[PDB]
Write a protein that binds this ligand. Structure first.
Ligand SMILES: O=C(Nn1c(=O)c(=O)[nH]c2cc(C(F)(F)F)c(F)cc21)c1ccccc1O
Ligand SMILES: O=C(Nn1c(=O)c(=O)[nH]c2cc(C(F)(F)F)c(F)cc21)c1ccccc1O
Ligand SMILES: [Cl-]
Ligand SMILES: [Cl-]
Lengths: 250, 250
C-alpha cells in the first residue's frame, strides 16, 4: 500500500533536517521535493516511504548500457516514484516514464550589476570579459558537447589556458564570483538561489538551453498521467511558485 | 494512412508562404511548426495533411464547458495531431494528450540596454519606471489572475489610470517600445524575436512564469509517447535549436 519513493540529497530539493536526536523515517528529510511529494500525496491519495538512492546517483549508463542511480531503482521496480530534480532526457525517457516537468530551467549567466553585458552573445563576441562553468557538470558538458557554433566558440575559450576558467563545484564557483572578477555559467535555478543571497549578483539574459525536472516512474506506471495532471494543478494554483519561494528565499 | 494535422496561423510557427499562383496543399505553409512536423514525420514515418483550425482558436471552454479550437478538433477526432504553439495547461491536459514540450517559454521583461533595471522585482519596488503588457493576452491575464503578492501589485500598477500602460496587440506594443519609454512584459519567445530585429532592445532578467508548447493528440493516441521521444531526440541533436534560429533569426 505504501509507495517507495527514491530521491537524492541535493540542496534545496532534498536535505537532512537539523536535529540532535537521530531520526528514522520521512521526518529525516525536508526540502522542495519533500513538499512536492506531500502535495502530490494529498491530491492523488497515497502513503509513501522516502528512500535515498543507495549509490547517490541520478542515473546514467555504463559502457555496457547498464543503468545506475534512481533510474535503475525504477527500472528494477525497487521504487515506485522518483521525486527529485531528475532531468528529463532522451536516453532516460526510453527506459522510464516521466511526468511533465514540475520545474523548468536552463543555463544562464551569473554576473554583476552595472555592466553593458546583457547576453551570452555579448560574450562570444569579445575577449576582455572572461567566463567559465563548474568543472565536469551539466553546464560544462553542454558547452563541451555542443555543435552550435556560438557555444563551441565559448567552449574553446572556457577550456583554453589549461581550463583555468572552470571550477571544482558550485560552492567554489560562487566564492570565485564573490572574490574575483568571474562569471559562472550555470543552471538558472542555482543562479536564482545565489542571487537571493547576494544582492550585487544578478542573472544576465535568459536561458541558453532548456530542460525540465520530472517525476520518474517505471514504464507503464499508472501514476505517470496522474502525477502530470497533479503538477499542472499545483502550477495553475500557484503552489509550485510558493514552494519554490519557500526553499529559494533569501 | 495520412494523418490530419490541425494548426493555426501564428508567426513564425505557421505562416502562408509567399507566392503569386494560388497554392493548395501543405506547400501553402511554412514556419517552425511545419519544419517540426517534417522532422517528426521522418523520425516516426508518417504522411500528413495540414489543415488550419476552422475557427482560428487554440482551444478554450465556454460557460457550458464546450471546447472550441484545435483542442475541439482533437476531442472530436477531426485531427490526429495538433502541431502548433499550443500551451500545455491543466484544463487541456484533462481532455487531450500532450507530448512533452518542444518549446519552453515564459514571461520576461523587454526593455532598453544601459539601465540598472535587471529584474521584475526591480520594478514592483519602484514607480519612476513604468510597465505594461498586451491587452487581453496571456501575459496580461497572468498578472490579472495572479495571487502572488508581487504580481498582484504589478497588476495594480499596470491596470491603473484607465489601463493606459496596456496595448492592443504585440505589433502595437513593439512600436510603443520603439517610439516611447515603454517596456512590454511578454512571452520570452516574442522578446527573442523582437530583439533579433532591434539592437537597442534586450530581454531583462529571466522568466517570470514557465510554460511549454506541446503537440496535442486525442486521448489515448498511440502517437503521444512516440512524439515525446522524437522531440527529445531532436533536442539532444541540436535540431530544435537550429529550427528556432532559422525562424527567429534577425
Ligand atoms: O545533468 C547532470 N547531472 N544531473 C542529472 O543528471 C539530473 O538528473 N539532475 C541533476 C540536478 C542537479 C541540480 F542542479 F539539481 F543540483 C545537478 F546539479 C545535476 C543533475 C550531469 C552531471 C555531470 C555531467 C553531465 C551532466 O549532464
Ligand atoms: O494563452 C493564450 N493564448 N494562447 C494559447 O492559448 C495557446 O495555446 N497558445 C498561444 C500561443 C501564442 C503565441 F505566442 F505563440 F503567439 C499566443 F500569443 C497565445 C496563445 C491566451 C490568450 C488570451 C487570454 C489568455 C490566454 O492565456
Ligand atoms: Cl505526460
Ligand atoms: Cl509524455
Amino acid at each position: 500500500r505504501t509507495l517507495i519513493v527514491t530521491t537524492i540529497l541535493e540542496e534545496p530539493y532534498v536535505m537532512y533536517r537539523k536535529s540532535d536526536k537521530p531520526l528514522y523515517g520521512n521526518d529525516r528529510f525536508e526540502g522542495y521535493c519533500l513538499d512536492l511529494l506531500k502535495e502530490l500525496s494529498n491530491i492523488l491519495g497515497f502513503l509513501y516511504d522516502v528512500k535515498l538512492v543507495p549509490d547517490g546517483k541520478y542515473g546514467a549508463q555504463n559502457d555496457k548500457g547498464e543503468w545506475n542511480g534512481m533510474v535503475k531503482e525504477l527500472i528494477d521496480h525497487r521504487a515506485d516514484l522518483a521525486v527529485a530534480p531528475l532531468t528529463i532526457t532522451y536516453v532516460r525517457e526510453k527506459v522510464i516514464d516521466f511526468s511533465k516537468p514540475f520545474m523548468t530551467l536552463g543555463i544562464s549567466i551569473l554576473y554583476r550589476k552595472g555592466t553593458p553585458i546583457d547576453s551570452a552573445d555579448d560574450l562570444a563576441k569579445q575577449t576582455k570579459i572572461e567566463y567559465g562553468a563548474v568543472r565536469d557538470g551539466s553546464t560544462m558538458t553542454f558547452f563541451k558537447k555542443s555543435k552550435i557554433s556560438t557555444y563551441e566558440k565559448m567552449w574553446a575559450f572556457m577550456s583554453s589556458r589549461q581550463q583555468s576558467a572552470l571550477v571544482k563545484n558550485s560552492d567554489e564557483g560562487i566564492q570565485r564570483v564573490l572574490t574575483t572578477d568571474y562569471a559562472l555559467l550555470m543552471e538558472s535555478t542555482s543562479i536564482e538561489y545565489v542571487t537571493q543571497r547576494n544582492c550585487n549578483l544578478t542573472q544576465i539574459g535568459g536561458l541558453i538551453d532548456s530542460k525540465g525536472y520530472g517525476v520518474g516512474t517505471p514504464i507503464g506506471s499508472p501514476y505517470r498521467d496522474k502525477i502530470t495532471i497533479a503538477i499542472l494543478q499545483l502550477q495553475e494554483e500557484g503552489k509550485l511558485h510558493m514552494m519554490k519561494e519557500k526553499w529559494w528565499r533569501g
